[model samples]
Target: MHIKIDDLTGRQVVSLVNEHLHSMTLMSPPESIHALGLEKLRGPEITFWSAWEGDELAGCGALKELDTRHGEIKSMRTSASHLRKGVAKQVLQHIIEEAEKRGYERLSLETGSMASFEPARKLYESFGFQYCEPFADYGEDPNSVFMTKKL
Candidate 1:
């Protein structure tokens, strides 16, 4: 698989990200859902990446700069066809490296704390992310799990 910087212009990228948002809605209540849509992910502060196997999309992820020293993971999702194929892992590692390259001291994310979110929680834990109280502009919520790793 090849991973490259993306401009959020490809049809496949937009469709897959929309699918990610839809999945989030099915699992988490609207208030607990935090995945950003394509337009927001295209912000100047965010860097997006897509993984592809030849012509087909494998997955996508993004890193958003919260500040000079802090970053947040946004819109990470593996295509349904690519699940369990290490696509998310590759995207996540790339985002982590990007954060470090930007001189970020911390990387954090907020995801659902529910049965539907178990796999995601496990994936983050495997990457050395630890449970933390809400960071940045996030407020406390029972349905949200905040995690962070020092870069």
Candidate 2:
């Protein structure tokens, strides 16, 4: 398995992002979606990675540099077909390592707190992420869950 840092171009990632949209739409409302689109992901503020199993894409995630010492997780989605196989966990661990390598002192993420998001919340907790407040362009929302970890 290889995890590659991907250029933000239209390709399999678009299909993977569509899958993210599917999950979010079914769980959260479309209007609540705040993730970066492919175009937005092209900016220098973000680093995106795609995980490949052989020639097939298994998942993807992104790290958004919030400050010299702070970073945020974004667009983390494991392929529906590959969930529960530790794909997401591996991708997330890699992203966290990268953030630490970049000299970040803390990493944060915004997810959902709905029943649909319990697994994700548990995953973050297992990785030592603790509850946090809304940051960046985020505001308070019952559907939103924020987590942070000090690296």
Candidate 3:
């Protein structure tokens, strides 16, 4: 699979992002969901990428700069049809590399604390992220699990 920096304007990217936000709503209560929609993903501080296999959109993820030395992982959805293809892993690795290249000393993310989110948490764990207290603008919430890795 190949990953490219995306401008969030492609039809496939928009569909996948909508799918992602829809899935998040299904998994968490409204107040507990942190997934960004199209407009927010386009913010100046966030950089987004879309993974592709030939002509198909495989997955998408984003990295948001929290400050000079820190970044946060956002979005991170594997297409419903592209599960188990290592799409998320590749996109994640790309974001981590980009963050490191930007001189970031920390990478962080927030995911749900539900059973459906286990696989995602495991994936982050495999990449050396450890459970951590809430960071940035987030406050403590039982439904949210925060993780961070020191770069």
Candidate 4:
């Protein structure tokens, strides 16, 4: 798979991002959905990447610098056609590597706690992310789960 920094302008990338947001809305209430839209993903503090298998977009994810020492994982999603293909794993590994390169002391993420998100939670746990209290601007919420890993 080819993983590269994306400018979020390509048609495939744009649609995939919209798909990500749409899926979040379906799984969680609007207030609990933390997925960022293209405009926010393009923020200076964030670096987004798209994973592709040749011409097909497989998945996408992003790392947002919470500060010089902390980074937050955001908008992780595998295209429907690419499910069970390890696309999420590859993209997540890429983000972790990038976070290490930037010298982030810790990495954290917010994800839904519902049954539908179990696979995602397991994925993060496999990467050594453990449950944690909310960081950054997030507050306690029953619908959200927080995880973190020290780099």
Candidate 5:
């Protein structure tokens, strides 16, 4: 598998990210869905990655800078065809490693608060992320589950 980043304007990156945000909206309230669009994520503070297995795009993940020593995981998604293939795990861990390499002392993420997110939650737990208060301008909301891991 190869993980590299390309310009987001490419249909591959934009379509997958749009699908990911759409899935999140389905699992959580619209108000609690906090994903930024492709344009927003193209900013300097966010680093995006796309994982490829052979010739196909398997998954993608991103890390968004919140402060000098903190980051928020964003847009973690495994293509439907790649589900259960550990692509998300690889991409997520890659983002974590990148954050740490960049001197981030803490990493946090917000995911849907529902059964549909069990797999995602379990993945994060395996990576040592624990429940935590909201970070990065996020407000308290029952439809959201905040998790954090200190590097």
Candidate 6:
């Protein structure tokens, strides 16, 4: 599969992002839900990427510039059919490399602590992210687990 910088106009990509938001609500309470919608992901500070295999949308990820030296991973989701196939891992690795390329000193993300987010947490951990206090505008929340990697 090849990765592309998505404009978020395609029906498949839009629907997948919507799916990601809906799934986030199911896993975390409203106050703990940090997943951004398509419009937010399309904002100037964010760069979105999608992975595709021919006509199939395998997954998508976004890197949001928090400042010149820091970025946050957002909107990462693997298509249901592509889950456990390393689609998300590939997209995540790409985002990490991009952060390094941009001279970002750190990359971070917030995910739920629920069982539903176990796979995602493990994936971040495998990529050298360590647990940390919430950064950015986020406040203390039991349902949220924040992780960061120094690039």
Off by over 4 Å in 2: 20-39, 42-44
**lDDT, candidate 3, 74-106, per-residue tens:** 666754653567777888888788887888888
- Number of the candidate with higher lDDT, 5 or 6: 6
RMSD of each: 3.6, 3.5, 3.5, 3.6, 3.7, 3.6
**Which ten residues in a row are the worst by lDDT in model 4?**
20-29
Residue 48 of model 1 has an lDDT of 77
Candidate 1 least-lDDT 10 residues: 20-29
Pairs of colliding residues, candidate 1: none
Q: What lDDT, from 0 to 1, does candidate 4 have? A: 0.72
List lDDT for all candidates, in order.
0.70, 0.70, 0.72, 0.72, 0.70, 0.71
Flag the better candidate by lDDT, 3 or 6: 3
Q: Model 3 — TM-score against the truth?
A: 0.77
Give the per-residue lDDT of model 6 (tens digit) for 1-151: 5778887567767777667544433444468444545456656755678877556777777776677888787666754644556777778878777777888778878676745467788888888888776864456787677778876
Q: Count residue pairs with overlapping backbones in model 6.
A: 0
What is the alpha-carbon lDDT of model 5 when measured against the actual structure? Answer: 0.70
Q: How accurate is candidate 6 locally (lDDT)?
A: 0.71
Flag the better candidate by lDDT, 1 or 4.
4
Model 1 Cα shift for residue 145 (angstroms)? 2.2
Which residue pairs show collisions in model 2?
A: none
Candidate 1 global lDDT: 0.70
Q: What does the lDDT read for residue 34 in candidate 2?
A: 67
TM-score of 2: 0.75
- List TM-score per model, in order: 0.76, 0.75, 0.77, 0.76, 0.74, 0.76
What candidate 6 gets wrong by more than 4 Å, as runs, is: 20-39, 53-55
Candidate 4 structure quality by residue, lDDT tens digits, 18-134:
674344334444574454454666667667788885667777877776778777776667546545567778888887788778777788776667554577888888888887777
Winning model by lDDT: 3
Weakest 10 consecutive residues of candidate 6 by summed lDDT: 20-29
Best prediction by TM-score: 3
